[PDB]
Each structure stands twice: as structure tokens, then as C-alpha cells.
Design a protein around this ligand. Structure first.
Ligand SMILES: Nc1nc2c(ncn2[C@@H]2O[C@H](COP(=O)(O)OP(=O)(O)OP(=O)(O)O)[C@@H](O)[C@H]2O)c(=O)[nH]1
Ligand SMILES: Nc1nc2c(ncn2[C@@H]2O[C@H](COP(=O)(O)OP(=O)(O)OP(=O)(O)O)[C@@H](O)[C@H]2O)c(=O)[nH]1
Ligand SMILES: Nc1nc2c(ncn2[C@@H]2O[C@H](COP(=O)(O)OP(=O)(O)O)[C@@H](O)[C@H]2O)c(=O)[nH]1
Ligand SMILES: Nc1nc2c(ncn2[C@@H]2O[C@H](COP(=O)(O)OP(=O)(O)O)[C@@H](O)[C@H]2O)c(=O)[nH]1
Ligand SMILES: [Mg+2]
Ligand SMILES: [Mg+2]
Lengths: 425, 419, 419, 414
């Protein structure tokens, strides 16, 4: 079993798209009712959904926000009945400190819903927490909830899908530096597995490869939901191999301190058979997904670990010969002092496919330190003259001093230094 | 769930324009019966009848009386309406301010999710300035942990309706700088120039100008009054734009403005619209933007805008060097989007538009405007002209000295932030 | 992706004619409505409406207003039609240069693949010439590297309203020479003679001359635009015509000028039209190329034309020993072929032709033309008569001496390339 | 397998009609579908194609251009859907220096496309390039591609079909000499094999023998594509001998630099008379007892080796040809496609090498020296970075061409 935690309007929209894609994959009616023909579905729908007392099926979802806007919008959406009303919370009525305060102030009901959903789940496997590290709501509240869940559930995994602020442009939120810094500090201290997303690269790929001039929020949500759906599908998709997320992730994490990933997947949202993919082959797809062009992120930096999941017909002999070809060209590189992996998964039996080969890659690259270097520089830039601190002075957590933020800065420094020295034996 | 308050004749007329535009947005008849978003600023009693959280004020009952008999006579609550800076604050304002606060609380307690108040006032009108000072002071004392935003009319550098504008401006600023959380100065002369250049009008009249101002106010409040893929609220406005408590006087702007005839003959390229927002001529205050650095900026789009297009447009604006920021803040945009587009008021000044943006930013040229005001005040203090119109109101020359040195300190702080 | 500019009465009228022709040949209603090719000159709006990339500027409003009240009044975006060389270069045009630059930037920013400019003007109107010089210099300094084509009008050496023409011509030619790319001379005397002899029109109204010149401009520009068996760009035109940075003033040519009735009296042989182009009396410039030599040529065709037949025709015509090139230009030609045929305005004087040609054959007799112009300039400058008009408008006799010396240097360069 | 690199308007068209000819030969639907009659076909297809899940075949071609017009028109053709949109590339917005500067600018995406196409095949042999040498687009872009390809794939053949400008008639580009000289220098530096072409004699033969007085570029380049396809036939159609491009190249190239060719096709009948006709200067499409280097012919349909031997002997006594005094031909055979009508009883195509080609280089070098003596039309070249400081590249290329001409003349003598 597994649960989803959905924070901030970005998290809510991403989760809505995620459930949309999932219910499409499993042939579940938007209301939350299985389709006639799907009665024989072999794939384990119990992983996320579960039978209700009325024979319906509902996602093991959780929505949290301080603004009823997007939640009400969804509740008027065609898929509102998909959710359980009891699994939804709204505030009575942007800064990390404010989010921390609210998280402190509503701990009770939040854990009430969480453990109400957990206890029924016989064999839980972890937590996935999709959100953005820029919104004051998401930042502080997710920080607080991650910390508290770590305190309460030490034997449980936690997964996060962060949405880093754009580096291509002036950050979309003025005080975003502080929010991102604090949230990343908390994530490093507590988070188990991470999936870093930068809206900049999402926008870049959407423009370049989808051939759409205004894809934006809907299409980028399509892409991210597809990524998450592919991962969770290859998990749930029954098979004699790769039947536990813990095992999959452990293959990618030499130590907890390094538990940040780098994503990639062949873009196929638009039908556009002529324009999307004319031909496919495991060799060319694996080659593509190695390039930075297809990644969703913006010193001989190299890789630390790479995993790939493939779908459709595949010839393992072809797979290993392709890997040998890739090694011969030395297109990429692994850690010197170090000693990859690939798995094959099915597809949704009913969902049609406009190809025969596709793949999703997860990588851990030391080049990821660039984002943290940028953020550290930005935060020091803000601290130089100490502006935008008045809001935090209003906050008890920062009413006295700011040692929390300073220690977060030094923790980030240690993390970046460890990443740097990782390549060096 | 936020309320609004209007002061001075300027505030009264601006509120009129804002409320008529709103009811057009939600299709509410003058009575208040339509043929969620609606409650965001309106209140529905037991019956379907709706009412806005509106309260005005004015010493002279002419405007209040006419609006009572005005076209929107049947909309507002009869009690919702309420009938020399020192006079505006001390000798007169103190008398009735308590009733105003009574009504204000009676409105607020009814609401549940309160966040702040919208302050609509001027800077020259002595009665308006003084009453606004007293009102916001009392509100802050009793309602400290809540937002408070000014949308005033900074005196134009060249055209002054009255003669004692510096007195009112300096008094209100010295009293309110600490408390006014974030103020949006808007100079009328900018409205004159932009309307002449874009709307293609010959005689600007306060009605048209106030219609435009309400248009910008609707633009800023749209991100609340409707859904959006990138929403925002008052706390965001008063946090992102406050590098320091003292420097919270961002400017205004509304680029897409064209007559129905000029509505066609173009595409409204969002990149072009944003550049227009940043064009020094199109700016909405007579303060050279090119002299001062855009310390902080905020953009609240509405209509059919798209994150990809805004990203490309803002990057294109970035590549131009003519716009420069402070060397210590590399990230200072507060982007904002909303699906609903602006609604053209029938027979109004503007024409139909699908994409609309409302820029807002803080610069340093406002320091030059402050210095101009201070120089005019130096002249006014040189002759000590007609100060006897204030001496008997309970104030003192020491008040003048402290307020003047306060303005000087504010200018010095702006200078520091510049370097 | 090119912008059309115009100056002076001539510029405005040529703009009118050319834009009318383009509208005709794109099947556009007079109001920009169509019941890609046009993409370069005609951007599109949200609805099925396009806008010419046109900018007309003149001191006297008369012509611009008349256009604004003309049949194609609705076509242009209303802001586009913005309203003695010393007068029009120093004290007046200088005070609208900024506005025209603003409009130009607004238009260009819309573009994506800008190539160059098509600046139309005349040496006649002193105001127009001075403003053209100033605007051209400002664009050159503003935009780094983009082509700056010009279709200017070269006054005849005898047949003209010769009163102050030589001074205007010298100043504009100097300024252009400093930063130009290539200006294409045309003379009303030549147009008059051509239409009288060939097209058989007794009183050629200035609009008819504009019609023919517009058809030439079409034959060149639409060929630049329309895809064809052998296409071409603007930078290609600039590089393939300028043997040296100073000698970039090719003449014009156009073969098919037959009226309707005699349009059936010929088979329209490609060789015949090419010869007519090389026929000295069919050139649109007062000069004898027999005296000079053809530095280089560019040949543009449209309609039913075949490259091999072109090759045969050019071979046959050049084999004629009368054509005398220089001994260092073994390859001085470029061809251009477009699928689309020429278009004729209903009621227009010209007759429809399945083929068409427009040649830009740089020659050297233009050197003799410059020589006579400079001689007449010196003669008129000897007395200095009617010059204080220039003197008081921001110029001095030093400027006259400087321009005289520069044109003498250019003539010396012409003589050099003549050997 | 093989790749095609077509540049400039000339290359774009060349590719269009080459693929039209190929699709006709292999029975390929314009949309890429395969006809029912060709379902059981035996002709190899991987040579110029790689099928797809939808059963459609995708040309191993990449479209390059500095301008959209031509390719945009192509994509409105009935054959548009056949091409692969991914491979195609159009500049967002005419001199060799500018072309090479852009080539430096857009290295990345170009070789992304090239690598993606290359990795999809196993038996890739070499490269095919179709470009014109006069226009700045084709010239400079081809120069850049050749340089970086030779510096990237040092184990692949590079085959180019250059189109040289008309000479007796004024060349269609005033700045033609510079671009031609530089492109020839690049070809000598890197290009493996070349098939020179000229519009002059090409159209001359098109009008004097094809009996068509209105030949547009369509018919000209259609004939050119015919030559291309007939050159590649046997490679496409496996037989016994000459079953690879390397076999072709080795049969002709005597030395590294001396690798220029001329071509011609007769039936644009007997195996004797056809190859006889392949010998005359008129049939050689291109426009001091200069002689041959190597001679090769390919025949279609029925052929009797007895006929071939007897005819070749008889022509040998007639001594209609000349050979190098200091060194010691070839007649290959192949089969026709099972689709196109055999309107000809037996055909014949020739691709020989002759020392007379030095004349074209002599003309071009004379023109370049003519211009350089007076520094004509150099103003724009200085604009680009490559020629920002000096023009030493021009001098080096001219001297290289002079050395090549000297080598040819030496090879004309023992
Ligand atoms: N832009 C604009 N400014 C207005 C409008 N109406 C009034 N004003 C300005 O607002 C200011 C008036 O301030 P109030 O406080 O409204 O004036 P009062 O209430 O008459 O003030 P006292 O005379 O001091 O009692 C002056 O600057 C007017 O020019 C309006 O419709 N539009
Ligand atoms: N091609 C063309 N040229 C014309 C036509 N009518 C006038 N001209 C030329 O335009 C010149 C007039 O100068 P413009 O620059 O056109 O007029 P302006 O700019 O209003 O004139 P000033 O204010 O006196 O400088 C005359 O000298 C003619 O040579 C016309 O119909 N066609
Ligand atoms: N991935 C994604 N990010 C978004 C979307 N909309 C806004 N954002 C980004 O997420 C952050 C906004 O955070 P939000 O959740 O809106 O903040 P809150 O006010 O704290 O809830 C900024 O970085 C926005 O750029 C969206 O649809 N998808
Ligand atoms: N034979 C032939 N040559 C062509 C064709 N199209 C263009 N060319 C040649 O290509 C050159 C024109 O320059 P190109 O590089 O093609 O043009 P650009 O792409 O506009 O710079 C000249 O040599 C033309 O003869 C065509 O269809 N056939
Ligand atoms: Mg008053
Ligand atoms: Mg004039």
C-alpha cells in the first residue's frame, strides 16, 4: 500500500492530473466506478485505490491547503466524486514560517486523516509527497509534515516530487530563496527519496518537443503525472522482479545524504503520431534519455547511479548489446571509485499505445550541485543587506533570532561539499 | 473575504467605479439580485439579495447624497454610507471616527475569513488625509495582525489642484509610513497622458480617469475574485513587495489600453504587452523609471495568459539592459495569472481585450519625487504661509520639523538601498 | 519579415500603390480580410485580420490625412501613420525622430526573422530627404547588422522642378553614402518617356507613375517572398550588387510595358524581354551605358519562365559585342524565378503579362550623372544664393565643402573602377 | 546503409526528386505505405530506408537550409507525409563565410540529428551529400559538415554530388568564384569521392537529346536523380559482384587527391552501341593530350557476357579511348527494378574519371585571381569572424587547388 500527500495549489493540480492519468490507465470511471470490461483487471488496483462500502473505489489521497480555491475548483470538476470528501482538508480562513505555523496549528486533524488511511492499509510501503518548494504554503507545511511523519513513522519511506523555482528567469516568487532553502534543508535532513523538478526545463521541453506554443500548466502537469504514473505502474505492475519501491530506490542511493534523483522520459503527451515519434528502438530511446535535452532540470561532473524502466516488446540480447555500444562510445561516465540497472514492465492492458518501445530514466548526477550553489549564492545575496526579514520578525519561530536559517545554510553547505567530494575518491 | 473603505471624494468616486465594474463582472443588477467567487467581496443575506462590504466617508454630504440617489441607489446598505489635514484628523475626524469604527466592526464580525482592508483615499484633500490617518491608526491599534493597503493619488510633479498639497502629503506620510503596509501611489497626470496617447480622447474627465483606476484595482483583485493556475492573496502582496517596512510604495501600470477602433489591427502579443508595461512612457507615475532601479516587481495577469508565454516574454524583457535592478536582489518578480479576462463596461473608455496584465513595482525615482515634494515644502516653510490654518488645530511647528526630518531619513534610506 | 518605410509625398504615394498591389495579389479585401507567402509583410491578428508592416512619416499632414480618408483607410493600424534639407534634418525631423523610433521598435519587436528595411523616399522633397537621412542614421546606429535597401527617386539632370534640388541631393547622398547599403535611382523623366513611347499614355498622372513603379517594386519584393525554382533573400541582394562599399547605386529596368491592345502583337520571348531590358531606351535612368560598363546585374523573373531559356537568352544578348563589361567581372549576374505571375490592378493601365522581369544592373554612367550634378552644385554654390535658409537651420558652409569633397572622392572611385 | 546530407535549395530539390525516384523504384506509396503487389518484394530496402511499426518506410535523409521556403513547399507536396519531421531542420530566420559561421553556430542540433540517424543502422557504409557550390548557403554549410564529419567519423565514406555553376553564360552568383574555390578546397581536404556537375552542359543535353524546349529545374534535377539512382542500383539490388560502395570506389580512385568524376546516361539497342554512346564527350553530362583514368559501366536487364566481351574487344581495337601511358577498364552488370516499365531494351550508365576536368578548375582559379587582383565584393566577407582579420584561408585554398591541378597535369604524363 501507499498514500499520497498533496500540498499547495501546485501539488493539488499535479495530484489531480496524477489521479486522472491513473484512472485512465486502470479504466476507472471519473466518478470512481470501475468500467464493465475491467472486471478481470489483473493489475493490482489495491496499491492506490480500495473498495468502498458502496462497491466504489477511491484514491488513497490527501489534499491540504490554506486556500479553498483550487480544492473547490476540483470539487466542481468531473472527477470530484473520485476523491473521498473525508480525505480533504481546508483552512478555516507566502512564507515558510507561516506554513510551519499552520502545520503546528493543525497537526491533530492532519494526522487523524493520515493514520485513518494508514491503519486500513495492511502492508504500507511508504509516502509520496508531491508539492512545490516555492509556495509559502507548500514549503512550510510540507517541511513540518515531513518532520512529524519522520518522528512518528521511523520505519516508513517518504518520497517527494519537488518543483524547484525557475533559474532561467527571475524567480516567480520574490522571497522564494528563503522558502526553497528551508524546504531543501528539511528534505535533506528527513526526506528518503526525492525527485527534483525545475519548471524551467519542463517549459523548455514542452516548447521544443511537443511543438506546442502554449502548453504550460496543463501539459507540464501531463508530463509530470506521466513520470510518476510510469514509476508507480512499474512498481504495482505484477512481475517476478521489481515488486517493492524500497528495493528499486535502494539501487540508486549509496547513502541517505545523496538521495536526490534526476529524471527523464520520452515525451508522448500529444497524440501527434506523425510529429511525436515516427519510429522507436530501445537503443535510440536510451541514447536520447541520457542527453540533458530530455531531462526535467536546468569539475568533470559524472553520474552516480542510473536506472531505466522499459515497456513493450524487448529483446534482452538487444538490451545488453545496446549497453555495450553505449559503453564503447563513452557518451556518459560513472563515478571513478565506484564499482547500472534496467527493468522491463508491462503497460495498461486497455490503454492503446502508439509505439512499441519507450522508457523512463532516473539518475543521480553530481552536476545537481549547481542548483544548490545558485540557491546559496542567492540567499547570501539577500542576507548581505538583510531585506524582507520583517515578515519573519512577526513569526515566533523567527521572533527571537534566525539561527534556524543560518544552520540550514551550513547544512546545505555540507551537502554541497559532500556532493563535490563524492566524485573524488 | 476582504472589505473595502473609501475616503475623500476621490475615494468615493473610485469606489463607485470599482463596485459598478465588479457587479458587471458578476452580472449583478443595481438592486443586487443576479439574473464561490461571488462572496469574495459580496454578502448575501437570508434572501438572495447581495451587498458588498463597502463603506465610504465624506464630510460634505453632497457626494454621499447623490450616490444614495445615484443609479446604484438600491445596492449599498443605507448605513454603510457615512457622512486642512489637522481638521480632517483632530478637530473633526475624532468626533465621528468612533461611529465609523462601529460600522466597520459590525461589517467585519459578520465575515469569517478576513485578511485585510482596502484603503481608498488621496494625499491632497485635507479632510480625507486626516481622517485616513486617524482611521488607519486606530485600525492598526485594534487590528494590528491584518493587512492594510493604500491606493492613493500622489500629487503630480507639475499640476496641483489645491495649494496646500505638501502639508497634507507630509502629514499623512509621517503618520502612516510605519503602519500603511503597502501603498500604490497613482498620479492622475499619468492617467491624463496615457489616456490622451492611447484611448485617443480630447477632454479627460474625472469619471473616465476613475473608471480606469477602478480597472487597475479590478486587475489587482482579480487573482482573488476568481480561480487561477497561479493564484495569490493579500499576504503575498504585502510580503513580496516589502524589502523593508519603510519602502513599500510600488507604482502601478496597465498596458493593454486601446479604443475599439484600435482593438483590431494588432494581436496583443503578451511579450509586447509586458514590454509596454515596462515602457517608461507607458508608466503610470511621472517618475523617470530609467533613473531608479526596479527594486521589486509584481505582475498579476488575467484572462487567457499562459505560463510558457509569460516565461518567454519576461526572458525577452530581461535580455534588454535598459532595465536594471539592485545588485543584491536577483529574484524579484511575483508572477500572477487568472483565467477570467477583464470585462469591458458598456459605452466605456476601453474596448474588449482578451489578455490583460497589471504590473506593479518599486523603483528609486520615487525618491526623486519625494525630494521634489520636500523642496516644495522647503519653499512653503520659507514663508510659513497660512500655517495659522493649522496652528489652532492642536499641531505644532515641532510636528513639522519631525515630519520633515522623517522624510529626509526616508530619502536617505532610499539612497542607501540604491547603493 | 521586412518593414516598409516611406518619406515625402512620393514615399506615401508609392507606399499606397505597392500595398494596394500586394493586397490584390494576396486576395485580400480592402479591409485586410481574406475570403506563409504574405507572412513576411502581413502579420495576422486573433481574427482573420492582417496589418501591413508600414510606417509613413511626413511633416505636412495633408497626404497622411488623405490616406486616412482613402479607400484603404481601415487597412492600416491607426498609430502607424505618424505625421530644404536643413529644415527637415536638424530642427523639425529631429523632434519626431524619437516618436518614429518608438513606433519602429514596437513594430519590429513583433517580428521574429527580420532581414532588412525597404525605405522609400525621394531626393526632391528637402524635408523628406533630411528626415530620411536622420532616420537612416538612427536605424543604422540602433540595429547592428541588417540590410537597409532603399528605392529612392533620382531627379533628372534637366527635367525637374530644379530650384533647390542640387543641395538636397548632395546632402542626402552624402549621409546615405556614409551608412547605406544600396539605393536604386529612378527618374520621372524616364518614366514619362517610357509610358509615352511604349504604354501610350498622353498625360501620365503621378498616380500612374506610382502604379508602374509599384509594379516594379512588386516584381522585386514578391519575388523575394514567393517561393520559386530559384529564390533569393535580401542579404543576397546586398552582397551580390556592391563591388565596393561606396558603389551601390544600381539602376532599374522592366521589360513588359505593352498596353492591352498590342499585348497580342508578340509571343513574349524571354530573349526579347531581356534585350528590351538591355535596350538603352528602355532603362529607367537618363544615361548612356555605352559610355559606362555594367558592374553586376540581378535578374528577377516571375510566371511561366524556364531557366534554360533564360540561359539561352542571356547568352545570345551578351554575345552582342555592344555590351561592354569590365575586365575583372567574369561573373556579374544573378537570376531569380518565381512561380507566381505578375498581377494587374483592375482598370490599371498596364496589361496582364504571363512573364515579367526586373533588373538591377549597376553601371558607371551614373558617374557622369553625379559629375553633372556636382558641377551644377558648384555653380549654384558660387553665388551662395538662397543659402541662408540652410545656414540658419543648423548647418554651415563647412558642411557644403565636406559634401563636395566626399562626392568628388566618390566620383574618383567611379573613375577608378572605370579602368 | 547510407545517409543523405542535402543542403541549399539545390540540395533540397535534389533530395525531393531522388526520393521520388527511389519510391517509384521500390514500390513505395507516397504516404510511406507499401503497395500490395510489392508486398512479397525481394529488392532490398534497408539501403535507403528503415521501416516503421506502421509499416511505412522513412528515408534516411536530413533536410538543411538557411531559408524555409523550399522545404515548406516540399511539406505541402503529396510526398510530404513521407519524410520524418524530426530529422528536418529549418533556420528560424548568401555567402560562404556566413554559411560557415552559421555552421559553427548550429553544430549541436545538426549532429544530434546525424547521430540519431546513424545509430539506427548496422551496415552504414558512407555518406551522400547533395549541394550546390555557388550559393553561400550550400557552399558554407557543406564545408562545415564535411570538416566536422571527417573530424568525427574517420571510418565512413563521404560521397558528394556537387553542382557547379554555368561558366560560358554568366554564373548565377556574382560572388561565385570565392564560394566555388573554397568549396573545392574543402572537398580536396576531406571529401572522399565526388561527382561534379554543371547546369550548362546538363541543360544542353537536356534540350538537344531529351527533346524538351522548356526544361524547368524539375526536369534537370529529375535527370540528376536518375543518374544518382542508376549509380546506386547494384548496391541496392544485390547480385554477385560490386555488392558494396567500397567496391565501386576502389575500382576508380587511383590516389588520395585524384578522385573527381563525370557521368552520363544514354536512354534518358545493344550492349555494344550503348557503351559506345557512353564514351562520347556529348554524353558526359559535365561541360596536352588529356586522357582517361578509369572507366566503369553498369547495364540493366538482359545481358550476354559473350556480347560484352566481343563488343569491348571490338571497341578496344578501334582505340576510341585513351589511357594513361604510365599505368594499366570495367563493365559491371545489374538488374532492373520489377516495377518500372522496361521501355528500353538495354540501357547503359557511365561514371569515368578524366584528366580534362582540370579545365574547370583552371577557369575557376583564373576567375578568382581576376577578382583578387582588384578586391571585388570582399566587404561582406570581412563581416564574418572567419575573415574578420585576414583572408589567408583564400590564399591557402587557391594554392591547394593549384597543387591539385599540377598533380593532375603530372598524372597526364609518365
Ligand atoms: N484621479 C482623481 N482624483 C480625484 C477625483 N476626485 C477627487 N480627486 C482628487 O483627490 C483629492 C481630493 O481629496 P478629498 O480628500 O477627496 O478632498 P476634500 O474631501 O474635498 O478635502 P478638504 O478640502 O481638505 O476637506 C484631490 O487631489 C482631487 O483632485 C477623481 O475622480 N479622480
Ligand atoms: N515616384 C513619385 N515621386 C513623386 C510623385 N509626386 C511627387 N514626387 C516626388 O516627390 C518630390 C516631393 O518631395 P516629397 O519628399 O515627395 O515631399 P515633401 O517631403 O512633402 O516635401 P518638402 O516638405 O518640400 O521637403 C517631388 O520632387 C517629386 O520628385 C509621384 O507620384 N511619384
Ligand atoms: N509544477 C507546477 N508548478 C506550478 C504550477 N503553478 C504554479 N507553480 C509553481 O509552484 C510555485 C507556486 O506555489 P503555490 O503552490 O502556488 O504556493 P502557496 O501559495 O504556498 O500554495 C511557484 O514556483 C510556481 O511557479 C503548476 O501548475 N505546476
Ligand atoms: N541544377 C540546379 N541548381 C540549383 C537548383 N536550385 C538551386 N541551385 C543552385 O544552387 C545555387 C544557388 O545557391 P543555394 O546555395 O542553392 O542558395 P541559398 O540556399 O538561397 O543560399 C546555384 O548554383 C543554383 O544553380 C536546382 O533546382 N537545380
Ligand atoms: Mg474636503
Ligand atoms: Mg519634404
Amino acid at each position: 500500500e501507499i498514500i499520497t500527500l498533496q500540498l499547495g495549489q501546485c501539488g493539488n493540480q499535479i495530484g489531480f492530473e496524477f489521479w486522472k492519468q491513473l484512472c485512465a490507465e486502470h479504466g476507472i470511471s471519473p466518478e470512481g466506478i470501475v468500467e464493465e470490461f475491467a472486471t478481470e483487471g489483473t493489475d493490482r488496483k489495491d496499491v492506490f485505490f480500495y473498495q468502498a462500502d458502496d462497491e466504489h473505489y477511491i484514491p488513497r489521497a490527501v489534499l491540504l491547503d490554506l486556500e479553498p480555491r483550487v480544492i473547490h475548483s476540483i470539487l466542481n470538476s468531473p472527477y470530484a466524486k473520485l476523491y473521498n470528501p473525508e480525505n480533504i482538508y481546508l483552512s478555516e480562513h507566502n512564507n515558510w514560517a507561516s506554513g510551519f505555523s499552520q502545520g503546528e496549528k493543525i497537526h491533530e486533524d492532519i494526522f487523524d486523516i493520515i493514520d485513518r488511511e494508514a491503519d486500513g492499509s495492511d502492508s504500507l510501503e511508504g509516502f509520496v509527497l508531491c508539492h512545490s518548494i516555492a509556495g509559502g504554503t507548500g514549503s512550510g507545511l510540507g517541511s513540518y509534515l515531513l518532520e512529524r511523519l519522520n518522528d512518528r513513522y521511523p520505519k516508513k519511506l517518504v518520497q517527494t516530487y519537488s518543483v524547484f523555482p525557475n533559474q532561467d528567469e527571475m524567480s516567480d516568487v520574490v522571497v522564494q530563496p528563503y522558502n526553497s532553502l528551508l524546504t531543501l534543508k528539511r528534505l535533506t535532513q528527513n526526506a528518503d527519496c526525492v525527485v527534483v523538478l525545475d519548471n524551467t526545463a519542463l517549459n523548455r521541453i514542452a516548447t521544443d518537443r511537443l511543438h506546442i506554443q502554449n502548453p504550460s500548466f496543463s501539459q507540464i502537469n501531463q508530463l509530470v503525472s506521466t513520470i510518476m504514473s510510469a514509476s508507480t505502474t512499474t512498481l504495482r505492475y505484477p512481475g517476478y522482479m521489481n515488486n517493492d519501491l524500497i528495493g528499486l530506490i535502494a539501487s540508486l542511493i549509496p547513502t541517505p545524504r545523496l538521495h536526490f534523483l534526476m529524471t527523464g522520459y520520452t515525451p508522448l503527451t500529444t497524440d501527434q503520431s506523425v510529429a511525436s515519434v515516427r519510429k522507436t528502438t530501445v537503443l535510440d530511446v536510451m541514447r536520447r534519455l541520457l542527453q540533458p535535452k530530455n531531462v526535467m532540470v536546468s569539475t568533470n561532473h559524472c553520474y552516480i547511479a542510473i536506472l531505466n524502466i522499459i515497456q513493450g516488446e524487448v529483446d534482452p540480447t538487444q538490451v545488453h548489446k545496446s549497453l555495450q555500444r553505449i559503453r564503447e562510445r563513452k557518451l556518459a561516465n560513472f563515478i571513478p571509485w565506484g564499482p547500472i540497472q534496467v527493468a522491463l514492465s508491462r503497460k495498461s492492458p486497455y490503454l492503446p499505445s502508439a509505439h512499441r518501445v519507450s522508457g523512463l530514466m532516473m539518475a543521480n548526477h553530481t552536476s545537481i550541485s549547481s542548483l544548490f550553489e545558485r540557491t546559496c549564492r542567492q540567499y547570501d545575496k539577500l542576507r548581505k543587506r538583510e531585506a524582507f526579514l520583517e515578515q519573519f520578525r512577526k513569526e515566533d519561530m523567527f521572533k527571537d533570532n534566525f539561527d534556524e536559517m543560518d544552520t540550514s545554510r551550513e547544512i546545505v553547505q555540507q551537502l554541497i561539499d559532500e556532493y563535490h567530494a563524492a566524485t573524488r575518491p | 473575504e476582504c472589505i473595502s473603505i473609501h475616503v475623500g471624494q476621490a475615494g468615493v468616486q473610485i469606489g463607485n467605479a470599482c463596485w459598478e465594474l465588479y457587479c458587471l463582472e458578476h452580472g449583478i443588477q443595481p438592486d443586487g439580485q443576479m439574473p464561490d467567487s461571488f462572496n469574495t467581496f459580496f454578502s448575501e443575506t437570508g434572501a438572495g439579495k447581495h451587498v458588498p462590504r463597502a463603506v465610504f466617508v465624506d464630510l460634505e454630504p453632497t457626494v454621499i447624497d447623490e450616490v444614495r440617489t445615484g443609479t446604484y441607489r438600491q445596492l449599498f446598505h443605507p448605513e454603510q454610507l457615512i457622512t486642512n489635514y489637522a481638521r480632517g484628523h483632530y478637530t473633526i475626524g475624532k468626533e465621528i471616527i468612533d461611529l465609523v469604527l462601529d460600522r466597520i466592526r459590525k461589517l467585519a464580525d459578520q465575515c469569517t475569513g478576513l485578511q485585510g482592508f482596502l484603503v481608498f483615499h488621496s494625499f491632497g484633500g485635507g479632510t480625507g488625509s486626516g481622517f485616513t490617518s486617524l482611521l488607519m491608526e486606530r485600525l492598526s491599534v485594534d487590528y494590528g495582525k491584518k493587512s492594510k493597503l493604500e491606493f492613493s493619488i500622489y500629487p503630480a510633479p507639475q499640476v496641483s489642484t489645491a495649494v496646500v498639497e505638501p502639508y497634507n502629503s507630509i502629514l499623512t506620510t509621517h503618520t502612516t509610513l510605519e503602519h500603511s503596509d503597502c501603498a500604490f501611489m497613482v498620479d492622475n497626470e499619468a492617467i491624463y497622458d496615457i489616456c490622451r496617447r492611447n484611448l485617443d480622447i480630447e477632454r479627460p474627465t474625472y469619471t473616465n480617469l476613475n473608471r480606469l483606476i477602478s480597472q487597475i484595482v479590478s486587475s489587482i483583485t482579480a487573482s482573488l475574485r476568481f480561480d487561477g493556475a497561479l493564484n495569490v492573496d493579500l499576504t503575498d502582496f504585502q510580503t513580496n513587495l516589502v524589502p523593508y517596512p519603510r519602502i513599500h510604495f510600488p507604482l502601478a501600470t496597465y498596458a493593454p489600453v486601446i479604443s475599439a477602433e484600435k482593438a483590431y489591427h494588432e494581436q496583443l502579443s503578451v511579450a509586447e504587452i509586458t514590454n509596454a508595461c515596462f515602457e517608461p512612457a507607458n508608466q503610470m507615475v511621472k517618475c523617470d523609471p530609467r533613473h531608479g532601479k526596479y527594486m521589486a516587481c509584481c505582475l498579476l495577469y488575467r484572462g487567457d495568459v499562459v505560463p510558457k508565454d509569460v516565461n518567454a516574454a519576461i526572458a525577452t524583457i530581461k535580455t534588454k539592459r535598459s532595465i536594471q535592478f539592485v545588485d543584491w536582489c536577483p529574484t524579484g518578480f511575483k508572477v500572477g495569472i487568472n483565467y477570467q479576462p477583464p470585462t469591458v463596461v458598456p459605452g466605456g473608455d476601453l474596448a474588449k481585450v482578451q489578455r490583460a496584465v497589471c504590473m506593479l513595482s518599486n523603483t528609486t525615482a520615487i525618491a526623486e519625487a519625494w525630494a521634489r515634494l520636500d523642496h516644495k515644502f522647503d519653499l512653503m516653510y520659507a514663508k510659513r504661509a497660512f500655517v495659522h490654518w493649522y496652528v489652532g488645530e492642536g499641531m505644532e511647528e515641532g510636528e513639522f520639523s519631525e515630519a520633515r526630518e522623517d522624510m529626509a531619513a526616508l530619502e536617505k534610506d532610499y539612497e542607501e538601498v540604491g547603493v
